Design a protein around this nucleic acid. Structure first.
Length: 62
DNA sequence: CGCTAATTGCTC
DNA sequence: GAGCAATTAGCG
């Protein structure tokens, strides 16, 4: 059952994703597209990173 | 094993 | 169509 290769984010991409998460828990479609373009990532990579980041946030705080 | 990226299937 | 919970799975 073919799956996508696991993305290895750069330190730069991870730093900028985390900065985005400290500013906003959720992104609008426009904020997601601006962030994907700025980080040379796909819209779905950013969406999924934000979803998995909220899961971790919930576990560590809840 | 632990961290976390990707997948699935459901709610809303 | 975005979120979320449960899950699968890559890599250090």
């Amino acid at each position: 059952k073919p799956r996508k290769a696991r993305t290895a984010f750069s330190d730069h991409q991870l730093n900028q994703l985390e900065r985005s998460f400290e500013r906003q828990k959720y992104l609008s479609v426009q904020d997601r597209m601006d962030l994907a373009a700025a980080l040379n990532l796909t819209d779905t990579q950013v969406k999924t990173w934000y979803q998995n980041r909220r899961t971790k946030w919930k576990r560590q705080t809840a």
